[PDB]
Design a protein around this ligand. Sequence first.
Ligand SMILES: [Co+2]
Lengths: 217, 217, 217
Amino acid sequence: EMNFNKIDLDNWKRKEIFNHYLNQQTTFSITTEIDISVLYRNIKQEGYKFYPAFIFLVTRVINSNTAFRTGYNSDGELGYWDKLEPLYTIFDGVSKTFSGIWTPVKNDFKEFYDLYLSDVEKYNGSGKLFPKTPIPENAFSLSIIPWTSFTGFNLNINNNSNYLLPIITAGKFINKGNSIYLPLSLQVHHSVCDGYHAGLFMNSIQELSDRPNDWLL
Amino acid sequence: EMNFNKIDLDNWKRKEIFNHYLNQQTTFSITTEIDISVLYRNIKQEGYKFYPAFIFLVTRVINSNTAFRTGYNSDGELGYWDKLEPLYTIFDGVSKTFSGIWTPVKNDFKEFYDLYLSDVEKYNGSGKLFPKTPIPENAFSLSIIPWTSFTGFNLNINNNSNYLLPIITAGKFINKGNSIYLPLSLQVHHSVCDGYHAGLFMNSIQELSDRPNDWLL
Amino acid sequence: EMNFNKIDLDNWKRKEIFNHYLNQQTTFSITTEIDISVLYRNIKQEGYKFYPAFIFLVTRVINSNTAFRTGYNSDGELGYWDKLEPLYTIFDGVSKTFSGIWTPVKNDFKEFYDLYLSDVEKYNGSGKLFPKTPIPENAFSLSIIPWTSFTGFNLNINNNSNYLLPIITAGKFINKGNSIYLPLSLQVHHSVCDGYHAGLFMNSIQELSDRPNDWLL
Ligand SMILES: [Co+2]
């Protein structure tokens, strides 16, 4: 069970802004395009499938800043987890449905990649939305829409809750000559993520994509 | 009165996902740009006005998959209609206001075009938001914003309801040399439309735009 | 205290549409890219900082149409103010936090610029979200996200209120050769702003950006 660090709200420099946007129930989506040219050429050179490389990359960025890992646990306690695991989309080409499964990211990419591969074989095609349960509490949602690109994406979730963890959505590649771009939307809760943290997320994605030798190979 | 096919929720493969996103009240907007170069050149060659051609095109895509036609009727019953009619924007240049009217799409484009033309003459300039009533229940909203282009568009409708039908918004053309692009935002309810269906919508719009000889002429 | 013009709802041509979207609680965000090449070259030639020039520009557009200045005052009365003041983001590079402060725009740019400069010196680095209080009621929010560009941005504010004033968010410049583009998202309430008014806003921003000699110099 992942370590959960309970937050002392009265002794948090964010107390005012946290409570402000909690009462306003304020999240924002920010959509851009990541240049994945270097990343894609490297995964192709290695014969790695792109999706798990991208899942691993996103998870690394999530685990680089506690603002991306702050939420309420199942007992309603505010805190942040040491690391999150990705809850990511998989597709059943037959039944024409998708599922969400999770795979731990403990260390290096190859270790994750092998577990991703076996998890997809085990849990795809089940007819269940969540065939791999229980889902760990320290999880973030990573969705992909491989059938169309986009320049804007927003989720309207009017569910009476203040869910504080980041929500990530990626789209179909856009090719411009020798460049390959990945539509990417980040949706975060302003109680824990400011514009600054959104910029940190996208810039970190881009910087890691351009340095695959540092974490992939 | 359009035929409404009542859905047997207990015998629907989507039951789990439908109820999941109904409870979460989850919709999403996805914005992209359609290449309308071929479509526009063809409507210009024929001397057809672009807007009704586009209304007809969108309606054809809506009527190509039941996931785009699923909702609650006025008695609160879940089902899907055999076909939807467009409820589309018209503008009064004088009073500087807009209205929403609907025109049935029964068969071929020319038949629709003539009814569109007479409906616009009859119902524009009324000072009423909805001058043509009653509006049929089997209708979807198609809005246009011809004064500015956009790369993202989202409606925040916090209205206590689970409205399940697609919502479409188009923007001002973007010219890039010999290419013409149409900003297009699709906003759908995840209980009935997944990322897959959103991709199906945008790819169908693009494919039909590039083959106007197949449905327009 | 800014003059507030109370609206006679029963004698407003917008009564129907206003009440319609108030009950639906409908706002929309529309994101585009402004070509700021001319504006940026001019502020650079003068040695003016870009941000206050942009704040002044946005405020001029806000103060050009009453649809951008309509809201409820603190006594719950519907009306529109003669002018709004910007409530804009400032950043503390140390503590790594932001604040919102407001500076009146009474006349010419230089007058505003000098007050902006002194307000930033006085009120930055305070540790308070709103260090300059009371905030005037005739204020609109202008946020900047200078760390990343974007092509879509939406705020999901599920706060039980019908806040009717415009919300503006700008992103990091995008350079394309000799052109400089500014990501810009406008989020408005459909009770008081239609697609038309959104187009008026973006087109006015663009037109003023391209004619800085008219308001800046
Ligand atoms: Co929303």
